[PDB]
Symmetry: C3
Subunit: 160 residues, 3 copies
């Protein structure tokens, strides 16, 4: 019901999709560490979205900070650097890992929408950072999906 | 936010669920080709839903056409022909492939709802064909799930 | 569109997520029987949510009864009894089975929200029992996820 409650739950659903990718996609050590850090960040995003903003909090805030987003942006550029240009649009799938990352990607985008909806409902009580974080995360998951498809992505083909 | 944006995103989520079925369900060659064609059609459905209808477009339209739907309807009848009558209601699951197709099936039905919602919000700017396509696709995925369960489906049992 | 239709469909999506857990998580005999019973209950929950309540029905009702909920509550206590105290918050994932149960858990919570929304839209024509059932089911799936992670859960870690 509550816009904050919905956004929080969607973050949890996106987080579980990353857990499935890690558990069923068998990523290498490097990718594993990146994904595990993201699971930790998504918990933070959920806590942030669920907690209304208060003036001069006396408790340690658990909020997504700009540095979280700067970090995803850095990983995006670092990982995308070693990839060839796309010849056609990518269809979701390929290796078990790429397929599972595409699933997480789409769930993350659904979570981004509710995070923005939370902001719309409480412009003064909800931070826009969780939404921006999820916005950058889906782009990173797209890149990682490509990284996880060594032999090329599944491509769309014009009807005729 | 936008009804078109939501419908588009749900199609992408359904498309990723089909990608997982293909990647983790190890379907045979025949089923693979059918599912790959559907992934291509779902991209088209997304492009259609996201693009508002314009009079006398000067660009090649990327729209779901009736022929897409006629094709799914044909596959439905062709595949359902070799199946026995249901003794009870089917519970989602069984083989890895059938279970993964049931997951995609339910996501497709969620996408169908937003496609219809897009039509409701813009009766003159959104085509009903994407929604009809998704409507027929969930029925086909139900049939394929049965096809992928050679030893029988998981059946519901009256409480007592 | 219809609040009952949406709630019904979400129950079906949650049911398919349990089917994936069973099909890809390879649970032992005990867990299998519990999950299979839940799939049967979720069918009932869907039928209940989809069928508006009528006075003096002449047909056998297919409704979630309090006994369904009492049963989940009993399993929750029985399974949680053999588990150690949590040292930190749990991140969704771990073993294939635990990861798949966390995915189902989050879908069940999404279904709970629409079941409550159905009640809100038709306070006199929709039972609150399906919603209560889903409320208890996500807590049980959390417990089972822990049970399925013999070597410990994936834990959240404070930023610094």
């Amino acid at each position: 019901t509550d816009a904050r409650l919905v956004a929080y739950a969607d973050c949890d659903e996106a987080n579980a999709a990353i857990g499935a990718a890690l558990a069923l996609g068998h990523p290498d050590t490097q990718i594993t560490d990146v994904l595990r850090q993201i699971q930790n960040d998504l918990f933070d995003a959920g806590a942030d979205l669920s907690t209304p903003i208060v003036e001069n909090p006396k408790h340690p805030p658990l909020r997504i900070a700009q540095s979280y987003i700067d970090r995803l942006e850095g990983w995006c550029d670092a990982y995308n650097a070693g990839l060839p240009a796309l010849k056609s649009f990518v269809l979701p799938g390929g290796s078990p890992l790429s397929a599972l990352l595409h699933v997480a990607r789409t769930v993350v985008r659904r979570a981004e929408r509710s995070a923005w909806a939370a902001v719309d409902a409480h412009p003064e009580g909800v931070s826009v950072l969780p939404a921006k974080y999820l916005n950058r995360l889906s782009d990173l998951l797209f890149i990682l999906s490509r990284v996880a498809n060594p032999d090329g992505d599944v491509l769309w083909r014009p009807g005729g």
